[PDB]
Design a protein around this nucleic acid. Structure first.
Ligand SMILES: [Mg+2]
Ligand SMILES: [Mg+2]
Ligand SMILES: [Mg+2]
Ligand SMILES: [Mg+2]
Ligand SMILES: [Mg+2]
Ligand SMILES: [Mg+2]
Ligand SMILES: [Mg+2]
Lengths: 106, 225, 187, 128, 125
RNA sequence: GGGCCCGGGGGAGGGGCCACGCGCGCGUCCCCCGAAGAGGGGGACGGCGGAGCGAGCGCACGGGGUCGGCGGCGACGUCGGCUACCCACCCGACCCGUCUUGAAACACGGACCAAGGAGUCUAACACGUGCGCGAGUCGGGGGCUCGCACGAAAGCCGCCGUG
RNA sequence: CUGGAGCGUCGGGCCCAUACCCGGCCGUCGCCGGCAGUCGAGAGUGGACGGGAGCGGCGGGGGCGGCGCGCGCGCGCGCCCGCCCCCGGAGCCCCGCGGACGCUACGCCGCGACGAGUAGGAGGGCCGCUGCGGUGAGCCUUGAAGCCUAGGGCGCGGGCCCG
């Protein structure tokens, strides 16, 4: 039960089980320990697969735009400030909001 | 020999009075650019709100990109996760301050230490005051006073930053080098706030002093320089 | 009101030879000079070795000094050992070498000279190549001491073989509970 | 008007009072010599308020004026005559102090040999 | 070699005197009694000394000969100068310098010469 | 409003410029004269030659940490002395040692003062460190040399490898 | 204490910690720190030496600029030709020909940072006690040890020196 929910890479493959190395924290020191788990208790973690898709695209966007020489934003970059814009009301003033009078519902 | 060396060194003497002139003039005119930009940026933000107001229309100015964070409570009885952040913003000692670049990850690190800090959006004069009067540069892991700008070029020259005034570009207009600019700046050590705070414990919005105060932080930087 | 751990701010490394032998203190006075001045990291390693302990600059056998000089290219250079050159009775074809060392055992001194070689000391090496140009820095195996066998996990923890301290090895000395599967268990 | 010093700075002394030992007043069995109190509930060692002060290092004299007499010269415990010509050169910086147990006859001979080569003596008019 | 001896004599010398938070060296013909390397008498192989003349008036100038040392009986030549405190000074001046004889002692030799003469004249009021 | 925006152009003596010489024939660009070109004139710009160019004393200085080229009284019953003697005051302040989560404790030892008084030696390991020698290296017991003054030391021995 | 020195909601102003700022000193740590005789302050080479020649230069970005320019290349003197010379003296803000006062090289020096503490560890103690091998041409009946001192002082202190 202490590995339930944990990820780890594969190092062995037997007929219907898979040796797999995970980390397990114990009173401090983290021990990289290898367990034998039959396949029914295992999935492919797409945690890896966001990258290898940013990779296949980065390697592609670098091979191209190299015949141009134009440097492209390859690195990710966190959500920036939201970049001053306009708002347009067309022919209405905004709707007036008022806090509504309390009444005991029960 | 003698008057073939005498000339050889005198040439190397003047070849500097060329360079330290050309370097002095380049700084001078880079400082004219940063006069025109900082004026066009002020105006053209007024230029625009004036133009939306003419129509039945509105303006939302840009989300501030630069926020200057001060720590306002000391160090004891401070949470684990709090203490990690505050040493990533480099607000180690109480009552010092650093320029943090606003960003989805940065903003979500100020939320988590809000009861300890007091941050807001600095204006130009607030940037100058901090950089000149209380601006020390990290050179060879030392707090060395920024007395002459051959100390700024000696550290940042690989980024087009060459003078005290070029530092302030990269600090105002967040720019490509904010990472190296605002990490050679040693954390600003500001005095106590002349006139006192309101309530160090509680948040600004409930009459206190903590957390974010958009643009009202400049009054706090006067009384604390 | 600052919040750094002063736990390990003081760095524990030797900055002077703990020994009193005036000779080692003299060529330390020499590479306390070269190390600060010349761009060569060479003497910065030579200096940082002249501090270290006997137990930390082990002797270099003569044969381990051959196969490190026989490698393709390092011909014509000088072997440089901050330590002693011992002899190796289990080696005979002594090529001509140029060696520097603090000490060279008397037997290895005659194997080297007889082969048309030359031995210097760390002050003539300063005049040969003050930058350390055309040199080879070597050392004996620091994990060579028999002490390093008793180090490790433990004897008696699972499949971690480490020699235990026993007053005298024999039949009846530590082959029992914990060693043969028949008597208790084994690891 | 004897033997000005080379440089007479402003000597400042952070504390001028002694450091008596805790409770060296109540009991006579206890000397005034400092002993660092090591009681669990001792109120000086935990530096309480209005208690006698514990000497520490940041309490110490300026590096320039250290060991300096109020006149300016450092003392040198000169023991006989030949140990005076040691100071023949280092004389405008520091001076000569004749040892207690010098007989009265050569205690003179040390005095006027110093006044020959201008070595101020702090106890020059002593035994007589 | 000089640097060798100095490592045997830095401490552990019969002329070294350490008291009252200073150190000093009473060895012969060293200027200003400094337990030092420059200002040492025996360790070196070219040394200049200046001590009063045994008469009461004058200044004697010890120069090590360096022709052959480990010959302490003659390795070591003296001379006398009884003159007018301005040529006296300019004799040790011309004797140390423009002889390239240890021009470290060059000034310390003079300040010891001058301080010798100040010690042989009417003493006090 | 930005392209130090473009600019052929006109003011009309608009303001302000860390511009820099004219001579002249460059890289580029713009303009104008010129055929679009060659070439010329003007300008932008570059650059450094078809030029550029080349030195003396001052204040200084809101310039790499203060100096005065300013001065005044005091002197045989009056100067100087921090710290330590006595006294005075304002603020502070509970008695030390100890076991203890917690001691000023209504917890225990302690009237006072002198002298005495407690992590030692041996053996055996272990690691670190210094030194000699180095596939070796000893050290003991013996032996050879003294009545020792220092000696019951030091020196030496295919003993030195029996081990 | 009672239109308050009471209770709510608010102003200004002021008061104070060993907290923060600036400064002084003391120590510790860091600086691959500097100093055993050397130029050099975003350093962005220095030197032969030959052939040819000279006002040439390297006719490159509104860049605003960093790599190249206006204190000189060549020059005044000897008279188009020669030189452009030697520190036993250039007169020195750089001196590479010789190096401090400073350099006890386990010495001296410049920068920064930092300094709560039981149990415990480590380091340093020209802190102290007794005795030995050295050494101080040490001290001493013209007064040693000890003791006594509202006598002058040094050290953060252990303690120490003097009267
Ligand atoms: Mg609290
Ligand atoms: Mg709270
Ligand atoms: Mg209890
Ligand atoms: Mg009670
Ligand atoms: Mg009990
Ligand atoms: Mg402490
Ligand atoms: Mg006695």
């Amino acid at each position: 039960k202490c590995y339930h929910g944990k990820t780890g890479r594969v190092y062995n493959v037997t007929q219907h089980a898979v040796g797999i190395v995970v980390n397990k924290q114990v009173k401090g020191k983290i021990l990289a320990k290898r367990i034998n788990v039959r396949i029914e208790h295992i999935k492919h973690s797409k945690s890896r697969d966001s990258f290898l898709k940013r990779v296949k695209e980065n390697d592609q966007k670098k091979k191209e735009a190299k015949e141009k020489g134009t440097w492209v934003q390859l690195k990710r970059q966190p959500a920036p400030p939201r970049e001053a814009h306009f708002v347009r009301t067309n022919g209405k003033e905004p709707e007036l909001l008022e806090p509504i009078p309390y009444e005991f519902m029960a | 020999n003698f008057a073939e060396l005498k000339i050889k060194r005198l040439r190397k003497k003047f070849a500097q009075k060329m360079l330290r002139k050309a370097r002095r003039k380049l700084i001078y005119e880079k400082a004219k650019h940063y006069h025109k930009e900082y004026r066009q940026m002020y105006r053209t933000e007024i230029r625009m709100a004036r133009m939306a107001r003419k129509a039945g229309n509105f303006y939302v100015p840009a989300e501030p990109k630069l926020a200057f964070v001060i720590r306002i409570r000391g160090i004891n009885g401070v949470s684990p996760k709090v203490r990690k952040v505050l040493q990533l913003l480099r607000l180690r000692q109480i009552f010092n301050g650093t320029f943090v670049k606003l960003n989805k990850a940065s903003i979500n690190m100020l939320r988590i230490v809000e009861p300890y800090i007091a941050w807001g959006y600095p204006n130009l004069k607030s940037v100058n005051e901090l950089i000149y009067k209380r601006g020390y540069g990290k050179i060879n892991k030392k707090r060395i006073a920024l007395t002459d700008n051959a100390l700024i070029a000696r550290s940042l020259g690989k980024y087009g930053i060459i003078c005290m005034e070029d530092l302030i570009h990269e600090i105002y207009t967040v720019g490509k080098r904010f990472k190296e600019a605002n990490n050679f700046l040693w954390p600003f050590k500001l005095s106590s706030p002349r006139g006192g705070m309101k309530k160090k414990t509680t948040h600004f919005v409930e009459g206190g002093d903590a957390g974010n105060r958009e643009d009202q932080i400049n009054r706090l930087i006067r009384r604390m320089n | 009101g600052v919040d750094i751990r002063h736990n390990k701010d003081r760095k524990v490394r030797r900055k002077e030879p703990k020994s009193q032998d005036i000779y080692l203190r003299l060529l330390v006075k020499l590479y306390r000079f070269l190390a600060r001045r010349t761009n060569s990291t060479f003497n910065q390693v030579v200096l940082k070795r002249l501090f270290m302990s006997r137990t930390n600059r082990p002797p270099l056998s003569l044969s381990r000094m051959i196969r490190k000089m026989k490698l393709p290219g390092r011909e014509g250079k000088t072997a440089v050992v901050v330590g002693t050159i011992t002899d190796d009775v289990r080696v005979q074809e002594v090529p001509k070498l140029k060696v520097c060392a603090l000490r060279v055992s008397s037997r290895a001194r005659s194997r080297i000279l007889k082969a048309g070689g030359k031995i210097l000391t760390f002050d003539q090496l300063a005049l040969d190549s003050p930058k350390g140009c055309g040199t080879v820095l070597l050392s004996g195996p620091r994990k060579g001491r028999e002490v390093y066998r008793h180090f490790g996990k433990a004897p008696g923890t699972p499949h971690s073989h480490t020699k235990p301290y026993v007053r005298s090895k024999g039949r009846k000395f530590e082959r029992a509970r914990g060693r043969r599967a028949s008597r208790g268990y084994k690891n | 008007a004897a033997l000005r010093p080379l440089v007479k700075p402003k000597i400042v002394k952070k504390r001028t009072k002694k450091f008596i030992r805790h409770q060296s007043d109540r009991y006579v069995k206890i000397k005034r010599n400092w002993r660092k109190p090591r009681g669990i509930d001792n109120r000086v060692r935990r530096r309480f308020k209005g208690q006698i002060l514990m000497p520490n290092i940041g309490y110490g004299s300026n590096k320039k004026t250290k060991h300096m007499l109020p006149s300016g010269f450092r003392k040198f415990l000169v023991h006989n005559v030949k140990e005076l010509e040691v100071l023949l050169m280092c004389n405008k910086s520091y001076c000569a102090e004749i040892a207690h147990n010098v007989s009265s006859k050569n205690r003179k001979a040390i005095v006027e040999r110093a006044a020959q080569l201008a070595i101020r003596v702090t106890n020059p008019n002593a035994r007589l | 070699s000089a640097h060798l001896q100095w490592m045997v004599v830095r401490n552990c010398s019969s002329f070294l005197i350490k008291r009252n938070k200073q150190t000093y060296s009473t060895e012969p013909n060293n200027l200003k009694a400094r337990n030092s390397f420059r200002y040492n008498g025996l360790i070196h192989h070219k040394t200049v000394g200046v001590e009063p003349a045994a008469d009461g008036k004058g200044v004697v100038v010890v120069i090590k000969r360096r022709s052959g040392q480990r010959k302490p009986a003659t390795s070591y030549v003296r001379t006398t100068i009884n003159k007018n405190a301005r040529a006296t000074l300019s004799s040790i001046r011309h004797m140390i310098r423009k002889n390239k004889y240890r021009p470290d002692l060059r000034m310390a030799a003079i300040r010891r010469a001058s301080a010798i003469l100040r010690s042989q004249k009417p003493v006090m009021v």
